């Protein structure tokens, strides 16, 4: 269906701003924050029919999620939270909401020029992570 054509590919992290503070707000502990904050992951996005797969590969952790838009799934996050996740496409932005322990955080993925921009928001704390094509 050409769903998510502009997101598909292999992307590498180039910059990460306010990410330690975002992780602190989420509740991530000191040692995980330091090591995860140092990671320079490769994000690999693929689509096969209705199923979207997002992989993240780095020295910190290798993760993989597969999902259908709008259809909740149970995720173990890279920081070891057990969350209920829903990913939707809203006006061309991939919107990932994670719910756990009466808390919520939203991770948005946007295509801007030749970049993929990731915005993570927890209450009033935002972090921006910019990816380029690998
Ligand atoms: C540890 N860590 C990572 C992370 C950090 C490094 C490697 C893997 C996961 C993320 C996300 C992963 C999705 C997205 C991204 O892929 O950049 C934005 C950050 C994240 C979000 C909340 C808390 C801790 C978190």
Swiss-Prot record:
Keyword terms of this UniProt record: Acetylation, Cytoplasm, Lipid-binding, Nucleus, Phosphoprotein, Transport
Subcellular location: Cytoplasm; Nucleus
Modified residues (Phosphotyrosine): 22
A Pfam family the protein falls into: Lipocalin
Record's keyword annotation contains Secreted: no
SUPFAM superfamilies, per the entry: Lipocalins
Binding, a fatty acid: 129-131
N-acetylcysteine: residues carrying this PTM: 4
GO biological process, one term: white fat cell differentiation
Highest taxon, organism lineage: Eukaryota
Primary location group: cytoplasm
GO cellular component, one term: cytosol
Span(s) of short sequence motif Nuclear localization signal: 24-34
Modified residues (Phosphoserine): 15
One function term, GO molecular function aspect: long-chain fatty acid transmembrane transporter activity
Domain notes: Forms a beta-barrel structure that accommodates hydrophobic ligands in its interior.
Subunit text: Monomer. Homodimer. Interacts with PPARG.
Family: Belongs to the calycin superfamily. Fatty-acid binding protein (FABP) family.
Task performed by this protein: Lipid transport protein in adipocytes. Binds both long chain fatty acids and retinoic acid. Delivers long-chain fatty acids and retinoic acid to their cognate receptors in the nucleus.
Protein name, per record: Fatty acid-binding protein, adipocyte
Source taxonomy: Eukaryota, Metazoa, Chordata, Craniata, Vertebrata
């Amino acid at each position: 269906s050409h769903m998510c054509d502009a997101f598909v590919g292999t992307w590498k992290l180039v910059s990460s701003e306010n990410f330690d503070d975002y992780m602190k707000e989420v509740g991530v502990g000191f040692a995980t924050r330091k090591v995860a904050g140092m990671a320079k992951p490769n994000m690999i996005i693929s689509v096969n029919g209705d199923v979207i797969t997002i992989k993240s590969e780095s020295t910190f952790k290798n993760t993989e999620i597969s999902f259908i838009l709008g259809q909740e799934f149970d995720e173990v996050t890279a920081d070891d939270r057990k969350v209920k996740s829903t990913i939707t496409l809203d006006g061309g932005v991939l919107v990932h909401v994670q719910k756990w322990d009466g808390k919520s955080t939203t991770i948005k993925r946007k295509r801007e020029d030749d970049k993929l921009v990731v915005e993570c928001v927890m209450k009033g704390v935002t972090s921006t992570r910019v990816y380029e094509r690998a």
